[PDB]
Amino acid sequence: PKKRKNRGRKKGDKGREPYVYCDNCGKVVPRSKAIRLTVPYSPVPPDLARELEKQGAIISRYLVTKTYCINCAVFFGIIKVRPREERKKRVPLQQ
Amino acid sequence: VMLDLLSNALTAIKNAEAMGKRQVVIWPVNKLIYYTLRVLQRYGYVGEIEYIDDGRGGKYVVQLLGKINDIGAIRPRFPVKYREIVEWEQKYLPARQIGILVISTSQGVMSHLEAKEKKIGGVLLAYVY
Amino acid sequence: YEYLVPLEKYLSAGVRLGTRLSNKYLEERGFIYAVRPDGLRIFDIKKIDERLRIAAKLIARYPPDRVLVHTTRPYGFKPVQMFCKFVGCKALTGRFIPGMLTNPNLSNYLEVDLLFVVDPRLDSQAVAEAAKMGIPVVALVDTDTPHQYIDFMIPCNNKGRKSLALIFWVLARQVLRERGELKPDQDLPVPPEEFETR
Amino acid sequence: PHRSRHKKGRSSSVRPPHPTVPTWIQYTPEEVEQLAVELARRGFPPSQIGIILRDQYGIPLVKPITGKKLTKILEEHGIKQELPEDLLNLIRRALRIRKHLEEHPKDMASRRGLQLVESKIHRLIKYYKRVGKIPQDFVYNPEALSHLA
Amino acid sequence: PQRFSRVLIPQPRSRFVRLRCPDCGNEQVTFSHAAMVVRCLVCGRVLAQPTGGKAIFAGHVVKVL
Amino acid sequence: WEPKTALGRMVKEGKIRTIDEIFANNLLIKEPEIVDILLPGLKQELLNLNLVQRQTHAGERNQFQAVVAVGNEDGYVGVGIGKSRQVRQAIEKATREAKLNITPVRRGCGSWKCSCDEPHSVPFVVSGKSGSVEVTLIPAPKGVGLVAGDVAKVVLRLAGIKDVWTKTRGDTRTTLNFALAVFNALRNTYYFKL
Amino acid sequence: SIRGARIYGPSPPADSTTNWPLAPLERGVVFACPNCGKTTIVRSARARKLGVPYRCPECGFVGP
RNA sequence: CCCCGGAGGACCACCAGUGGCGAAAGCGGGCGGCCAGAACGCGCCCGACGGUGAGGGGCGAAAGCCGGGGGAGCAAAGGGGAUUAGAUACCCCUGUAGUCCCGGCCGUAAACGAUGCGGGCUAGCUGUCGGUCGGGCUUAGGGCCCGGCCGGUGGCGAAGGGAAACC
RNA sequence: CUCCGCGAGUGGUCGGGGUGUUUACUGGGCUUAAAGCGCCCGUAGCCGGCCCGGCAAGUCGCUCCUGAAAUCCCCGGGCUCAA
Ligand SMILES: [Mg+2]
Ligand SMILES: [Mg+2]
Ligand SMILES: [Mg+2]
Ligand SMILES: [Mg+2]
Ligand SMILES: [Mg+2]
Ligand SMILES: [Mg+2]
Ligand SMILES: [Mg+2]
Ligand SMILES: [Mg+2]
Ligand SMILES: [Mg+2]
Ligand SMILES: [Mg+2]
Ligand SMILES: [Mg+2]
Ligand SMILES: [Mg+2]
Ligand SMILES: [Mg+2]
Ligand SMILES: [Mg+2]
Ligand SMILES: [Zn+2]
Ligand SMILES: [Zn+2]
Ligand SMILES: [Zn+2]
Ligand SMILES: [Zn+2]
């Protein structure tokens, strides 16, 4: 049976996708079907009491987006296996 | 590409009647559409047939009465002889007393009942019930 | 034209305010008046008042016990209580128990010949049993409401407290005048302010 | 393309149902015909001639005013086209592509566009031979028609 | 345009306008949706500019026919 | 019997005395006793009895699924299904929804080989479907008989139909669906816009 | 249409606006005109779902 | 590992989307030149010139073949280090065709929407792309918002259909 | 042992038809069960807008010459009924 009307990748009215490479992997997928979670990121986490407002310590915080496949995304808890009724509910992937 | 206007018009009535609509617009149109709708109105399957004048052939607006259980055009336009109309009668109609066929005979378009009284056959057009 | 209630009262309760959605059904029927440049839909208040009177005419032709006035929206809980406590319908605020009209073995198995709901898009279970059980339905529809199985509709703002209070005060008043206990110029003992919920 | 297009548009001009002469018109039927001949001798095609009449001179439609059509009007005053205007347009479109294909032999997208245009030519030649507007021996030779560019 | 099977009697949505050239003062009839540069017939300055829709008018609009 | 609901009251009180008034003003029967009061000459037949099993850890938990058709042979029929753990209960549940699902059927003539105006057959061509079985009921001349299958003859006979021709489709060996499709074709006769 | 055909059984309440028969087991709805209360309005279950409008034969009132 | 320079081949991150274009395959940096095909607006031209299409033809991923050029990264085959009962696999180091360009051949794919092409009719609600018209604002912009039409692209869902998933 | 079906018959293997809407004109199906060519240009074929006038080819009605006899259907009669 055709699970998912989407086919698993929101491709659109085209024939082919450019595809990317999976971090921690390389099994990967096209541009759709690839998880692209973004996390805030910053070196030296909560040392801002003893750093930053101590000496000068101009600290930086770089938004980083990470790309994964279905294997890695399920492996790192970014993706669960939802029930059938819950498959159609659009929830953000905790950033 | 639009090929047969009579089948297009007859299916519009079937579609609009099944939604319980009061009227239906028909376009494009020919004399065969009009002469068929006159036979329909003569048997109480159709209300008033108003005509509109555009540059593109013209339109008919037909008031439906909920009197149609099914309708459609017989394709292809089969020739039929007078002695054969009984056989075609039981093909498209339920019961011996219910429903009519629309025949295009040399004297004009008439119901299959009026063709049987005249003792002539012709080219089959449609069925109503 | 003569309004049932003075026009500054209607436009102070905002009854002519609809949701910013689209309703192709209502617009063709004529219950939509005009859309503002911010996209807000405004109803025709003349059609609102005319439909309130006919609603009172329809309700008055049934016994007061046999009419059920139910909403699950908590802004309409107080108005529907005060609507009928003056008319005596089986007011039901809260969960319409499924099976109330279709299960005769239920302890709350009511038998009603008319049903009145506030918002059919949220009071779907009430309307659902009406369609199955063949009971007429009235409702305060607006732009967001599905029109299925609604034999009489009143296009009005069924979301605000002031609109709900001012609509049930008018409707509660008018049904008494058609019923008889109030004069054509007589008014209710309470103003619309006591109908509104809190 | 001709078949399996992604989009099927509806763009067209909605003319009046029974067009009659405009009351504002300041042009007799003889003035309207003479205006078209001046444009024709200027070199505009019959499609573009009608646009100049409407846009510049405010003539809505030459047919109700004059009772004739633009090509029929131009035909009477000695303006005779080598081929019908639609056919000549398709032939010129093929030469401009076949000229392109010389220096770009690997333009596969342009080749299919040539094949669509060169099939539209063949349909019109089939029609025009049947009605007699072109000679029955006419053949689309792209090299023999280079003067039409 | 809309479907002909829906609209009863389709009519042109365009209109014909009469324009007076701001320079000379000739009155001219032109199409509202002009697909070309409309020039005043006498002095020749630009009266209408074509776009993808309604034309832009450089001359005053006396009355829309 | 206590007349719950109100339609049972008028049926018990004698305010409603004939079954036609239930069906001539669209009153939905909710209690089998209304049918028992108003159709005392009702016959019921066991159309089918299939054993359906549901698997579990300890093994299948069997049940009986009985199909019952009821009718007076005078244009009233009804088919109902019952699932129980014992066969006697399953038939009784079968008869209850059988009685609750009872419906009038329009009868008459209309065959080209007949001219009697009797209710022996179906008036016009009708069709009813259940799942994949599609059954067409065709009017027949008098004296032909029922030209259906065996289970179809039971439902047709209980509705007081004497002569009929049939044109079936799909798997008719699914007796629950063949019987239900035959029931629906009879009930579809009231959907004909006369 | 129908010519000398006898159809037996009860005749259900025909829809006032469509002639759709209020079939057994599919419950329609009957009431009087909301404005007058004189004429009787019959709405089959199909018309209620589709929102087919009705009109009073006596007064000009039209419903949903 | 860090800095100053040079050379080389491939790719075009974020923006970026069930976004766009294309008949399918397919197409993602900027500027330019030559072409193609559409959508919208139109009182422009012709006047049925149309649909489908056996046979016939053309285009057609990847791998692969023929001859030339090129060769950074990756990497069939192979070499080695491990693991293992075995390990001619999975991992690691390395590695040659190949991957890239040009001319030709092959003509296949889960070449898929597993859904042939053309046309008409049949509730609606909602996101978004292109054009256009009306109203309101303006980073006074080719800009933004509201509404209508036409044409695409997603979701939910009338009637209806289905063995059902579902359309 | 007893019972069942048919009976001067009753069985076995073949072949045809029904079975069988599993050949689908009436009257099937092709997302997933077998089944849409990877896509497109197009020849024959098939299918094709509206109105007016002419012909009457198809088509329809009547009649005639025919389509051997036998066979087939209906009606009457003769073998005792029957064949
Ligand atoms: Mg692909
Ligand atoms: Mg919106
Ligand atoms: Mg051809
Ligand atoms: Mg081929
Ligand atoms: Mg390759
Ligand atoms: Mg390596
Ligand atoms: Mg190498
Ligand atoms: Mg396929
Ligand atoms: Mg299927
Ligand atoms: Mg099959
Ligand atoms: Mg395909
Ligand atoms: Mg093949
Ligand atoms: Mg082709
Ligand atoms: Mg002849
Ligand atoms: Zn991965
Ligand atoms: Zn000037
Ligand atoms: Zn009979
Ligand atoms: Zn009335």
Swiss-Prot record, chain B:
Report the protein name in the record: Small ribosomal subunit protein uS8
Please describe the quaternary structure of this protein.
Part of the 30S ribosomal subunit.
Similarity section:
Belongs to the universal ribosomal protein uS8 family.
What UniProt keywords apply to this chain's record, in alphabetical order? Ribonucleoprotein, Ribosomal protein, RNA-binding, rRNA-binding
Say which species the protein is native to.
Answer: Pyrobaculum calidifontis (strain DSM 21063 / JCM 11548 / VA1)
Q: Name one GO cellular component term.
A: ribosome
Its Gene Ontology biological processes?
A: translation
Its biological purpose: One of the primary rRNA binding proteins, it binds directly to 16S rRNA central domain where it helps coordinate assembly of the platform of the 30S subunit.
Gene Ontology MF terms: rRNA binding; structural constituent of ribosome
Q: Which gene encodes it?
A: rps8
Swiss-Prot record, chain C:
Concerning Pfam families, the annotation shows: Ribosomal_S2
Q: State the Gene Ontology terms under molecular function.
A: structural constituent of ribosome
- Indicate whether Ribonucleoprotein appears among the record's keywords: yes
**What GO terms fall under cellular component here?**
small ribosomal subunit
* Any single GO BP term: translation
Keyword tags: Ribonucleoprotein, Ribosomal protein
**PANTHER family (UniProt xref):** 40S RIBOSOMAL PROTEIN SA (PTHR11489)
Belongs to which family?
A: Belongs to the universal ribosomal protein uS2 family.
Protein name per Swiss-Prot or TrEMBL: Small ribosomal subunit protein uS2
* Source organism (scientific name): Pyrobaculum calidifontis (strain DSM 21063 / JCM 11548 / VA1)
The major lineage groups are: Archaea, Thermoproteota, Thermoprotei, Thermoproteales, Thermoproteaceae
- The encoding gene is rps2
Swiss-Prot record, chain D:
For this chain, one GO molecular function annotation is: small ribosomal subunit rRNA binding
Keyword check for Ribonucleoprotein, yes or no.
Answer: yes
Task: Cite the residue spans of the region called Disordered.
Answer: 1-23
What Pfam families does the annotation carry? Ribosomal_S13_N, Ribosomal_S15
Kindly give the SUPFAM superfamilies that the UniProt entry links to this protein.
S15/NS1 RNA-binding domain
One biological process term from GO is: translation
Q: Which domain of life is it from?
A: Archaea
Name a single GO cellular component.
cytosolic small ribosomal subunit
Keywords per UniProt: Ribonucleoprotein, Ribosomal protein
The record's listing under SMART domains reads: Ribosomal_S13_N, Ribosomal_S15
What is said about its interaction partners and assembly? Part of the 30S ribosomal subunit.
> Which NCBIfam families does the protein's record reference?
PRK08561.1
Protein name (database record) = Small ribosomal subunit protein uS15
Per the UniProt record, the source organism is Pyrobaculum calidifontis (strain DSM 21063 / JCM 11548 / VA1)
Traced from the root, the source organism's taxonomic lineage reads: Archaea, Thermoproteota, Thermoprotei, Thermoproteales, Thermoproteaceae
From Swiss-Prot, chain F:
- InterPro entries per UniProt: Ribosomal_Su5_D2-typ_SF, Ribosomal_uS5, Ribosomal_uS5_arc, Ribosomal_uS5_C, Ribosomal_uS5_euk/arc, Ribosomal_uS5_N, Ribosomal_uS5_N_CS, Ribsml_uS5_D2-typ_fold_subgr
Q: What keywords would UniProt list here?
A: Ribonucleoprotein, Ribosomal protein, RNA-binding, rRNA-binding
Q: Where is the S5 DRBM domain?
A: 42-105
**Residue ranges the record marks as coiled coil:** none
What are the GO MF terms of this UniProt record?
rRNA binding; structural constituent of ribosome
Q: Name one Pfam family in it.
A: Ribosomal_S5
Q: Which GO terms describe its cellular component?
A: cytosolic small ribosomal subunit
- Going by the entry's taxonomy, the superkingdom of the source organism is recorded as Archaea
Question: Biological process GO annotation list?
Answer: translation
Function in brief: With S4 and S12 plays an important role in translational accuracy.
Present the record's domain note.
Answer: The N-terminal domain interacts with the head of the 30S subunit; the C-terminal domain interacts with the body and contacts protein S4. The interaction surface between S4 and S5 is involved in control of translational fidelity.
Q: How does it assemble?
A: Part of the 30S ribosomal subunit. Contacts protein S4.
What does the sequence similarity comment in the record state about its family? Answer: Belongs to the universal ribosomal protein uS5 family.
| Name by which UniProt lists this protein | Small ribosomal subunit protein uS5
Q: Provide the species name.
A: Pyrobaculum calidifontis (strain DSM 21063 / JCM 11548 / VA1)
As recorded in Swiss-Prot or TrEMBL, the protein's gene is named rps5
